Amino acid sequence: SEVAHRFKDLGEENFKALVLIAFAQYLQQCPFEDHVKLVNEVTEFAKTCVADESAENCDKSLHTLFGDKLCTVATLRETYGEMADCCAKQEPERNECFLQHKDDNPNLPRLVRPEVDVMCTAFHDNEETFLKKYLYEIARRHPYFYAPELLFFAKRYKAAFTECCQAADKAACLLPKLDELRDEGKASSAKQRLKCASLQKFGERAFKAWAVARLSQRFPKAEFAEVSKLVTDLTKVHTECCHGDLLECADDRADLAKYICENQDSISSKLKECCEKPLLEKSHCIAEVENDEMPADLPSLAADFVESKDVCKNYAEAKDVFLGMFLYEYARRHPDYSVVLLLRLAKTYETTLEKCCAAADPHECYAKVFDEFKPLVEEPQNLIKQNCELFEQLGEYKFQNALLVRYTKKVPQVSTPTLVEVSRNLGKVGSKCCKHPEAKRMPCAEDYLSVVLNQLCVLHEKTPVSDRVTKCCTESLVNRRPCFSALEVDETYVPKEFNAETFTFHADICTLSEKERQIKKQTALVELVKHKPKATKEQLKAVMDDFAAFVEKCCKADDKETCFAEEGKKLVAASQAA
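-> structure tokens emitted (578 positions)
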């Protein structure tokens, strides 16, 4: 009985929470009350199985049991659509059908958060419903959210309410915490989303290599065998979570942190604090841990990998292992390279080995292999520096503006909503990485870009419109950032003239958060560029400042809807002339 074995490993609370997450990630349009029913029904069944593993339907697969439950309230196409088609399938077709329909950008009313008062009362009224609601709204908005991490966020959301609803100034205590959890959520979500894209689009081999690189940088003292065991465990974990096997994902993740904490002397010396923490914390802590110190007397990679005569012998006899070794050795020595760079390097090395080892004197043709690495190393470095420089001068917001422009001209066919979000997330790269010295900058910066760019890819994949986006996204996981950066202005694109309603603002803009006000303007900048690319320099930085001042004056104008309207169907020709 699989559902029984998972109930006992996880315990009831986490079981309950994960099942609800599973359900809200497959059926993102279903109401909260209907998911709750399904979840409780499964939990009750799960208990009958813990009581008797040989009891009736207890030997069923989780996919079957879960999928049967989903199909009971899925023949309602006026709300959902083509999930009733999933229900006419046998497993695992039904399951793959469901995952297939996961919507990275749902059509979902934004959640207006109640006053602190109200929320605090609701938290006291019914703590459990309040917390399930939290889980439900994140998971349906984030269909690939790393589930075990989402238990960790929910635990901290509960703690935030537990502390702050007893504060003397509840709002001042509560809001900065909620705003932090929100920001950490999105970042976690995007981060995980890259892992799932890698697995689903590029295969297990690609994820494993990503893991070899990242874990070898982070645990440079570990032997190859230890790292390899860790990669296999981590792969299994993320393969399950990305395929909606959320119960087995959590359980294996808890097994993995257990293993790590018990073998700290073979892994890293940075772990001590992490392994002291409560279970969910410990796992979150380990995934986030600082790289360990590099062993002191590390020899050259030349001896093993370019000078030896056994290179071809060692390569041909077990190549994924040989190349695994190469990546481990190179990665542990370079915490200052990005994971993507390290993977490029390993790709080059593989290619030249495939060629040379089948040539006359192989030892000669591959004797120069490392020489090929340096232009690969130089390129990200030079991009960061030039962009980090630009950030310091503009600051975050204006840096976003410059990147909106750069990207709107790179790929004008892309959705405005998608261009705004991705460019905003691009701009946040400066704030997170330009702080650092140039040996911590690249892994910070280019690996974060991997995440943002993948987001552009997943948001475009639905309704592809730019062939340039489709290309960069499909050709190669690792080269995505180089490929997107190489793109120059698109001469094919025809401007969308001028919609006067697109450039006219209204009084409702005044009651929005400041950050919302910004997005509205970054939105209008994108449209400005779409309708007038090519021939437009810093005469955009001009109009951008014009709109800010425009919305400034009108929000104070004591107006009768008037200021925004009068400085509307007259103002627009100015941003139509230049």
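The radius of gyration is 26 Å.
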